[PDB]
């Protein structure tokens, strides 16, 4: 049972990816239709911008604040900056705010969520000036709670745009997140595109293309039915009413923020869309260990919150069938990959190992071809290398999350165990198939296929090295940031 196992895997992956591509294109066409017919110089939704940061890089924080200040939206109420501060080290972010914005820092002795009076009037008196708050260190959820309280006590704000402390918005990023809120009276959240800008390392470039795929294909496919599972942290928008209703359960229930908020909007039976015309530039980890740690946390959150999307699907009627199927697909893909690798490793057949390798390479090449076509970029073919990352940085993270949820230490022991198992399986296959036979056509196929695959991967890596030598891999924003940081 080998041919069926590979053909089923190939169909199960590529057909769903193509369906996601088609749904994403339909969503993008609908959003482009919405953007057209919009009056020129449109500003109707009064917007409160909320930034939550904790010991941010001063340069990136200044860039984020200046990108907010340079935005071309004419109906922004004020900027609410909330810091897990109150300390001496966290005063540098306050000083940066003061040098870009008002000198309106407030240092209350308490966090709003822990008090018998949760109104923002105890810390705010003027709803006009941009405000900076130095909270005691409690967490992202508490700072977002203070932001919600400060934004919701002004009876004119209609929506809140939540951004991170490292995102560099484009001049029309704010305009393109708060416009879809005005197109359907059931849309309560909107997610914007997040783009990775620091593509100066191979891991960073692969993660950038993974982000491009996960936003412009997966999130677009989700948004065609208006059931986006996660609103991106770097750039999101929520109506103020849904914030008022879902804020309290979200704060009296760690890293599930922007995923539990989206989940609360989903169990309320409200719709969420994703717009690809709102771009926020964030960064990605350049280290394998930190990437694995972040993915372990994300997988913990995903397996913790997937059981709520599957019980709240019926609220959406028949549009939740896609949500349930996507959850089932994400569950079964991991098991399919694990079982397929185990079978190919244990059986140790060269003509099946080569077939699996070549089929996977062809599927990834097709995905990268579409990514290059959509992005109008020739660097998207670098995505053909991402199959390594998922195998060597995502499987151990998912296993660790699973073995933590219902059970170095635990974090960095399953990673080395997985790597040792993979290396042992490879060595076992090579040692079990050590012979040369140029008369056999099947051996010729296997050897030529494996040599062609290694040649192709080496050519791609050499192209990456040449591109990195000439600094051709760098995004234009990355070159601008390098020059500006040199100037500082």
């Amino acid at each position, epitope marked *: 049972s080998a041919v069926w196992g590979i053909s089923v895997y190939g169909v199960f992956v590529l057909g769903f990816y193509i369906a996601q591509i088609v749904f994403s294109e339909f969503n993008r066409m609908r959003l482009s239709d919405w953007i057209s017919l919009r009056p020129d110089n449109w500003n109707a939704t009064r917007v409160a911008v909320i930034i939550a940061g904790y010991r941010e890089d001063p340069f990136m924080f200044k860039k984020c604040l200046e990108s907010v200040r340079d935005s071309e939206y*004419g109906n*922004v109420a004020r900027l609410i900056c909330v810091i897990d501060g109150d300390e001496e080290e966290d005063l540098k972010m306050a000083e940066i705010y003061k*040098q870009v914005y008002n000198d309106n820092v407030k240092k209350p002795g308490v966090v709003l969520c822990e008090s018998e009076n949760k109104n923002g009037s105890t810390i705010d008196s*003027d709803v*006009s*000036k941009n405000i900076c708050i130095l909270q005691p260190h409690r967490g992202k959820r508490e700072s977002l709670y203070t932001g919600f309280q400060l934004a919701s006590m002004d009876p004119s704000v209609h929506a809140v745009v939540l951004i991170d402390s490292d995102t560099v918005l484009e001049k029309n990023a704010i305009l393109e997140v708060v416009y879809p809120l005005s197109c359907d009276p059931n849309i309560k959240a909107v997610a914007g595109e997040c783009k990775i800008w620091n593509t100066d390392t191979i891991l960073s470039m692969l993660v950038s293309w993974r982000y491009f795929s996960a936003f412009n294909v997966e999130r677009g496919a989700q948004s065609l039915w208006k059931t986006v599972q996660c609103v991106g942290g770097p750039l999101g928008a929520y109506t103020i009413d849904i914030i008022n209703e879902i804020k309290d359960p979200w704060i009296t229930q760690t890293y599930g923020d922007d995923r539990r908020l989206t989940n609360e909007v989903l169990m309320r039976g409200k719709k969420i869309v994703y717009t690809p015309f709102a771009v926020g530039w964030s960064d990605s980890p350049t280290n394998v260990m930190r990437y694995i740690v972040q993915q372990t946390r994300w997988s913990k959150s995903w397996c913790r919150e997937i059981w709520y999307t599957l019980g709240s699907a019926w609220k959406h009627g028949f549009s939740g069938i896609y949500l349930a199927f996507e959850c089932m697909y994400q569950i079964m893909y991991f098991f399919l990959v694990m079982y397929l690798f185990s079978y190919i490793a244990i059986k140790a057949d060269i003509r099946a190992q080569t077939a699996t390798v070549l089929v996977s390479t062809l599927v990834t090449i097709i995905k990268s071809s579409y990514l290059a076509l959509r992005a109008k970029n020739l660097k998207a073919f670098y995505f053909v290398l991402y199959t390594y990352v998922y195998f060597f940085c995502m499987i151990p993270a998912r296993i660790t999350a699973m073995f933590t949820m219902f059970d170095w230490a635990k974090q960095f022991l399953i990673t080395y165990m997985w790597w040792a198992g993979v290396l042992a399986a490879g060595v076992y296959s090579i040692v079990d198939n050590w012979y040369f036979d140029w008369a056999d056509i099947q051996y010729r196929f296997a050897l030529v296929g494996i040599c062609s695959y290694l040649v192709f991967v080496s050519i791609v890596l050499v192209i990456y090295l040449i591109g990195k030598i000439t600094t051709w891999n760098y995004t234009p924003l990355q070159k601008e940031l390098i020059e500006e940081r040199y100037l500082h």
Partner: nanobody
Amino acid sequence: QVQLVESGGGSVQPGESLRLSCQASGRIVDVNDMAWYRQAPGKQRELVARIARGGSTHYGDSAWGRFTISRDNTRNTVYLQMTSLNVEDTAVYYCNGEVKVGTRLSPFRTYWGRGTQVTVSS
């Protein structure tokens, strides 16, 4: 060290304009936002209008349709236009600004003005 000039008001009859102009000082790197606060002889001070460099406007509880605010950022000045005044507009108007003095690295400092008296009586 910066000052706000204030154009000056006076005594006016109900139902006319004032054209309150507030001009900033000299050496200035940037001006972010400027507002026109008001202090009545009644209950404390309040806000009438606030204008930003990007054109966003924040009005008070009685400015929605009566007083407008304009920037004209050429000479770091602010203008307030008054319409349909009533006998409750007698107060002292203060100019509020956020100004840099030294350089880009200098923080934005909030500055207030001496203020002008506006009286509306028959």
